[PDB]
Write a protein that binds this ligand. Structure first.
Ligand SMILES: CCn1c(CO)nn(-c2cc3c([C@@H](C)C(F)(F)F)nn(-c4ccccc4C)c(=O)c3cc2F)c1=O
Ligand SMILES: Cc1cc2nc3c(=O)[nH]c(=O)nc-3n(C[C@H](O)[C@H](O)[C@H](O)COP(=O)(O)O)c2cc1C
Ligand SMILES: O=C(O)c1cc(=O)[nH]c(=O)[nH]1
Ligand SMILES: [Cl-]
Ligand SMILES: [Cl-]
Ligand SMILES: [Cl-]
Ligand SMILES: [Cl-]
Ligand SMILES: [Cl-]
Ligand SMILES: [Cl-]
Ligand SMILES: [Cl-]
Length: 368
């Protein structure tokens, strides 16, 4: 098709050529610019009824979202919907602006279809992102009503003494502009951050976040999700499940990047510090989804993320317990046509496997 035409040209020729000419962070920045300007191939794929998902108090036209980290500062939201994503997540956003780690801080592993990053929460800060989202607040309200919700992922400043107050500030400032908020406690690139996944610290943190969210006016009151690492102990996962059910957290995002280095990585840059994304993360993420779904008795919506670059990858996460999926790293290798590719392949597999739609497949592996 013209679809598989663009998919082949981007994957085989355009993206490898452009990535060969540019430093990885330069490629990221240009991508945000092109997306914000709508300089994108046609998204030929027409979302069908069988891809619609109702979760987190919203309609999602399709279950494929852009993961946090691509649009950290909310500059490219409308262009990301134009790419065919069913939902957009921006961030992480920190309270105050901060530069993040020194460059280079992004590394390509094309032999592994992976990336390693150590951006360190480079952020324009809440004030700048607030004003950027306010400029399109009513445009977003219409997109959300039309099944295209917006998520905002909150982080904490490097030098902050009170992590919970940083997240609370994010809820107050960006909560009113979001369909869902993400308490990102799983960056591998902020010292001490992943310790906030521990039981006593998570319960205190999430209580404060939920109190702040509950204090927002009804039309401005987002869902709250916790985004977790793929590197948790069994004890950590049990504790997170316990706290999420105790406090009525609305959902989980499973998973962030890994600080592991699976056996078999080939890229020259495999021993760089940072979080590993893409294909080597895929099954570690899927198995984290599977465990979190079971520990929460299928009662807590999961957004599955890590190494999705095909319909099969998306359906494996859905059958493991994800209601929605996200991708980022595949877009660095395949370019924008990957979104229609994943959607087309997912629709075909749902039909092949006897599912009426995405909803019927959620958690299907647990019922075998
Ligand atoms: C992890 C950091 N990181 C890297 C490095 O690891 N790459 N990367 C992306 C780059 C791109 C680029 C680059 C090559 C360009 F901008 F330099 F071309 N272009 N495009 C594109 C092509 C044709 C038309 C419209 C767009 C947006 C994309 O979609 C795209 C996505 C990405 F995630 C990205 O976020
Ligand atoms: C360059 C880069 C930056 C990221 N920054 C963030 C971030 O700010 N917040 C966050 O929650 N996740 C961040 N992530 C993690 C992604 O959202 C996602 O969880 C992870 O990359 C796995 O999905 P993927 O294999 O499809 O990329 C980042 C990932 C990459 C590759
Ligand atoms: O800013 C980053 O370094 C970043 C944050 C996050 O949550 N995950 C990731 O892989 N990198
Ligand atoms: Cl719902
Ligand atoms: Cl659109
Ligand atoms: Cl590189
Ligand atoms: Cl408002
Ligand atoms: Cl363990
Ligand atoms: Cl390891
Ligand atoms: Cl590391």
């Amino acid at each position: 098709a013209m679809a598989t035409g663009d998919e082949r040209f981007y994957a085989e020729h355009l993206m490898p050529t452009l990535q060969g000419l540019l430093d990885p962070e330069s490629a990221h920045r240009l991508a945000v610019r092109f997306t914000s300007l709508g300089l994108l191939p046609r998204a030929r794929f027409q979302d069908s009824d069988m891809l619609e998902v109702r979760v987190l108090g919203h309609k999602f036209r399709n279950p494929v979202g852009i993961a946090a980290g691509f649009d950290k500062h909310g500059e490219a939201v409308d262009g990301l919907y134009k790419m065919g994503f069913g939902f957009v997540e921006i961030g992480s956003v920190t309270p105050k602006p901060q530069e993040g780690n020194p460059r280079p801080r992004v590394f390509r592993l094309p032999e592994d279809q992976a990336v390693i990053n150590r951006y360190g929460f480079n952020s324009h800060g809440l004030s700048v992102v607030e004003h950027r989202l306010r400029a399109r607040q009513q445009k977003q309200a219409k997109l959300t009503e039309d099944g295209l919700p917006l998520g905002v992922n909150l982080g904490k400043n490097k030098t902050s003494v009170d992590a919970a107050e940083d997240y609370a500030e994010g809820v107050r400032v960006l909560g009113p502009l979001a369909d869902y908020l993400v308490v990102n406690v799983s960056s591998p690139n902020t010292a001490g951050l992943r310790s906030l996944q521990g039981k006593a610290e998570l319960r205190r943190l999430l209580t404060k976040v939920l109190q702040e969210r509950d204090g927002l006016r009804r039309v401005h009151r987002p869902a709250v999700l916790v985004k977790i690492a793929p590197d948790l102990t069994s004890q950590d996962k049990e504790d997170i499940a316990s706290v999420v059910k105790e406090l009525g957290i609305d959902g989980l995002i499973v998973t962030n990047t890994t600080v592991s280095r699976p056996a078999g990585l080939q890229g020259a840059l495999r021993s760089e510090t940072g979080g590993l994304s893409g294909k080597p993360l895929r099954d570690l993420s899927t198995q984290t989804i599977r465990e979190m779904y079971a520990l929460t008795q299928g009662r807590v919506p999961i957004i599955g993320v890590g190494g999705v670059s095909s319909g099969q990858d998306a359906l494996e996460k859905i059958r493991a317990g994800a209601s929605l999926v996200q991708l980022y790293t595949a877009l660095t290798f395949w370019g924008p046509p990957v979104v229609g590719k994943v959607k087309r392949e997912l629709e075909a597999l749902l039909k092949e496997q006897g599912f009426g739609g995405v909803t019927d497949a959620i958690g299907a592996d647990h019922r075998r």
